[PDB]
Amino acid sequence: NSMKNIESLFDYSAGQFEFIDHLLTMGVGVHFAALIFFLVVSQFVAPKYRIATALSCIVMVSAGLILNSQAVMWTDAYAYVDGSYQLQDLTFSNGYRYVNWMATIPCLLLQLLIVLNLKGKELFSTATWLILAAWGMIITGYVGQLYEVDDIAQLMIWGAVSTAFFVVMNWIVGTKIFKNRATMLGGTDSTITKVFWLMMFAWTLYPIAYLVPAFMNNADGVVLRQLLFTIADISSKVIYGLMITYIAIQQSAAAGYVPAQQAL
Ligand SMILES: CCCCCCCC/C=C\CCCCCCCC(=O)OC[C@H](O)CO
Ligand SMILES: *C\C=C(C)/C=C/C=C(C)/C=C/C1=C(C)CCCC1(C)C
Ligand SMILES: CCCCCCCC/C=C\CCCCCCCC(=O)O
Ligand SMILES: [Cl-]
Ligand SMILES: [Cl-]
SS (H, E, C) the chain: CHHHCHHHHCCECHHHHHHHHHHHHHHHHHHHHHHHHHHHHHHHCCCCCHHHHHHHHHHHHHHHHHHHHHHHHHHHHEEEECCEEEECCCCCCCHHHHHHHHHHHHHHHHHHHHHCCCCHHHHHHHHHHHHHHHHHHHHHHHHHHCCCCCCHHHHHHHHHHHHHHHHHHHHHHHHHHHHHHHHCCCCCHHHHHHHHHHHHHHHHHHHHHHHHHHHCCCHHHHHHHHHHHHHHHHHHHHHHHHHHHHHHHHHHHHCCCHHHHHHC
Q: Is 131 in the pocket of ligand 3 (CB under 6 A)?
A: yes
Ligand nearest to the CA of 69: 4
Q: Is 170 in the pocket of ligand 1 (CB under 6 A)?
A: yes
Based on the structure, what is the number of domains in the chain?
A: 1
| Angle, alpha carbons 19-25-30 (nearest 5°) | 120
Tell me which method was used to determine the 3D structure.
X-ray
Cα radius of gyration rounded to whole Å, the chain: 20
Name the residue type at position 65: L
Question: In Å, how far from its chain's centre is CA 182?
Answer: 28
C-alpha 68/C-alpha 32 separation (Å) is 11
Domain region containing 152: 1-264
Work out which ligand 1 atom sits closest to the CA atom of 170: 14
Mutate to test the pocket of ligand 2, among 199, 206, 229 (most ligand atoms within 8 A of CB): 206
Q: Is 59 in the pocket of ligand 2 (CB under 6 A)?
A: no
Mutate to test the pocket of ligand 3, among 56, 123, 244, 252 (most ligand atoms within 8 A of CB): 123
Task: Measure 79 CA to ligand 4 centroid, in angstroms.
Answer: 27
